[PDB]
Design a protein around this motif. Structure first.
Motif, PDB file in Angstrom:
ATOM      1  N   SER B   6       0.859  -1.216   0.000  1.00 21.67           N
ATOM      2  CA  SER B   6       0.000   0.000   0.000  1.00 21.67           C
ATOM      3  C   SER B   6       0.883   1.251   0.000  1.00 21.67           C
ATOM      4  O   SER B   6       1.704   1.442  -0.874  1.00 21.67           O
ATOM      5  CB  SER B   6      -0.884   0.000   1.248  1.00 21.67           C
ATOM      6  OG  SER B   6      -1.770  -1.109   1.196  1.00 21.67           O
ATOM      7  N   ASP B   7       0.720   2.103   0.975  1.00 22.99           N
ATOM      8  CA  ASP B   7       1.549   3.341   1.030  1.00 22.99           C
ATOM      9  C   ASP B   7       1.817   3.713   2.493  1.00 22.99           C
ATOM     10  O   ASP B   7       1.283   4.681   2.998  1.00 22.99           O
ATOM     11  CB  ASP B   7       0.796   4.484   0.347  1.00 22.99           C
ATOM     12  CG  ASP B   7       1.025   4.416  -1.164  1.00 22.99           C
ATOM     13  OD1 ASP B   7       2.079   4.846  -1.604  1.00 22.99           O
ATOM     14  OD2 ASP B   7       0.143   3.935  -1.855  1.00 22.99           O
ATOM     15  N   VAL B  10       3.537   7.348   3.094  1.00 26.04           N
ATOM     16  CA  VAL B  10       2.588   8.497   3.052  1.00 26.04           C
ATOM     17  C   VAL B  10       1.762   8.526   4.339  1.00 26.04           C
ATOM     18  O   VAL B  10       1.397   9.575   4.830  1.00 26.04           O
ATOM     19  CB  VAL B  10       1.655   8.345   1.849  1.00 26.04           C
ATOM     20  CG1 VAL B  10       0.887   9.649   1.630  1.00 26.04           C
ATOM     21  CG2 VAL B  10       2.482   8.027   0.602  1.00 26.04           C
ATOM     22  N   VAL B  11       1.464   7.382   4.891  1.00 27.80           N
ATOM     23  CA  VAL B  11       0.660   7.348   6.146  1.00 27.80           C
ATOM     24  C   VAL B  11       1.469   7.967   7.286  1.00 27.80           C
ATOM     25  O   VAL B  11       1.066   8.944   7.884  1.00 27.80           O
ATOM     26  CB  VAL B  11       0.314   5.899   6.491  1.00 27.80           C
ATOM     27  CG1 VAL B  11       0.023   5.784   7.989  1.00 27.80           C
ATOM     28  CG2 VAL B  11      -0.924   5.476   5.699  1.00 27.80           C
ATOM     29  N   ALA B  13       3.691   9.929   7.285  1.00 24.33           N
ATOM     30  CA  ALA B  13       3.793  11.391   7.030  1.00 24.33           C
ATOM     31  C   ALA B  13       2.426  12.040   7.266  1.00 24.33           C
ATOM     32  O   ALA B  13       2.331  13.177   7.684  1.00 24.33           O
ATOM     33  CB  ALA B  13       4.227  11.626   5.582  1.00 24.33           C
ATOM     34  N   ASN B  14       1.366  11.322   7.003  1.00 19.69           N
ATOM     35  CA  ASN B  14       0.007  11.896   7.209  1.00 19.69           C
ATOM     36  C   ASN B  14      -0.237  12.109   8.705  1.00 19.69           C
ATOM     37  O   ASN B  14      -0.407  13.226   9.164  1.00 19.69           O
ATOM     38  CB  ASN B  14      -1.043  10.930   6.654  1.00 19.69           C
ATOM     39  CG  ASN B  14      -2.131  11.723   5.929  1.00 19.69           C
ATOM     40  OD1 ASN B  14      -2.656  11.281   4.926  1.00 19.69           O
ATOM     41  ND2 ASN B  14      -2.496  12.885   6.399  1.00 19.69           N
ATOM     42  N   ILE B  15      -0.248  11.056   9.474  1.00 17.62           N
ATOM     43  CA  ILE B  15      -0.476  11.219  10.936  1.00 17.62           C
ATOM     44  C   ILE B  15       0.489  12.283  11.458  1.00 17.62           C
ATOM     45  O   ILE B  15       0.139  13.097  12.288  1.00 17.62           O
ATOM     46  CB  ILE B  15      -0.236   9.887  11.654  1.00 17.62           C
ATOM     47  CG1 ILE B  15      -0.549  10.037  13.151  1.00 17.62           C
ATOM     48  CG2 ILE B  15       1.226   9.470  11.483  1.00 17.62           C
ATOM     49  CD1 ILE B  15      -2.029  10.384  13.347  1.00 17.62           C
ATOM     50  N   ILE B  18      -1.039  15.575  11.270  1.00 17.01           N
ATOM     51  CA  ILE B  18      -2.014  15.803  12.372  1.00 17.01           C
ATOM     52  C   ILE B  18      -1.244  16.204  13.632  1.00 17.01           C
ATOM     53  O   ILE B  18      -1.668  17.054  14.390  1.00 17.01           O
ATOM     54  CB  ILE B  18      -2.799  14.517  12.642  1.00 17.01           C
ATOM     55  CG1 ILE B  18      -3.909  14.364  11.599  1.00 17.01           C
ATOM     56  CG2 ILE B  18      -3.421  14.583  14.038  1.00 17.01           C
ATOM     57  CD1 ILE B  18      -3.291  14.199  10.211  1.00 17.01           C
ATOM     58  N   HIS B  20       1.620  17.737  13.695  1.00 13.68           N
ATOM     59  CA  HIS B  20       2.166  19.104  13.492  1.00 13.68           C
ATOM     60  C   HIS B  20       1.161  20.123  14.021  1.00 13.68           C
ATOM     61  O   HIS B  20       1.512  21.034  14.750  1.00 13.68           O
ATOM     62  CB  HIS B  20       2.409  19.365  12.007  1.00 13.68           C
ATOM     63  CG  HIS B  20       1.888  20.730  11.661  1.00 13.68           C
ATOM     64  ND1 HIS B  20       2.713  21.843  11.603  1.00 13.68           N
ATOM     65  CD2 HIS B  20       0.628  21.183  11.372  1.00 13.68           C
ATOM     66  CE1 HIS B  20       1.943  22.902  11.290  1.00 13.68           C
ATOM     67  NE2 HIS B  20       0.663  22.554  11.137  1.00 13.68           N
TER      68      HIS B  20
END
Lengths: 43, 43, 43, 43
Positions: B6-7, B10-11, B13-15, B18, B20
């Motif tokens: 999957s990715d 990117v995950v 980095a996504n959480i 949140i 940040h």
């Protein structure tokens, strides 16, 4: 065979959304560095 | 079947994004002085 | 039958990423309103 | 087959986020004075 993504625009838009935060936040902390970037720095 | 990933990058980095903002709102919350506290712990 | 999403964490994390910008930006513009929110305003 | 809809609302809000920063960086770019321009148009 390839189910493809069900939302390529959202994900493709998330990669930039994250990089954005890393930048907007990196500026709030290194606001000084950003000011220097615009002022010369290019050579 | 050669595709199987999957990715996760990117995950994480996504959480992180949140998180940040969690610091952004937490910073605006705590200004400077004005801080009441009830003495009650191991001391 | 249900292919499900290939990245539920990324999308589920994007919804908050967007709402975040709308807030962080709404504060930079209405920075005054935010200051009032913390100061009383609750009743 | 009853399901047949992606997430257009989240998308419009996503690209909007990218636009939010476009104004952020554009604002930091234009400070106040310092602005050279070559007179050349319909005037």
């Amino acid at each position: 065979r390839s189910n493809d993504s069900s939302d390529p625009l959202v994900v493709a838009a998330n990669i930039i959304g994250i990089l954005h935060l890393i930048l907007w936040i990196l500026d709030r902390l290194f606001f000084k560095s950003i000011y220097r970037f615009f002022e010369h720095g290019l050579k």
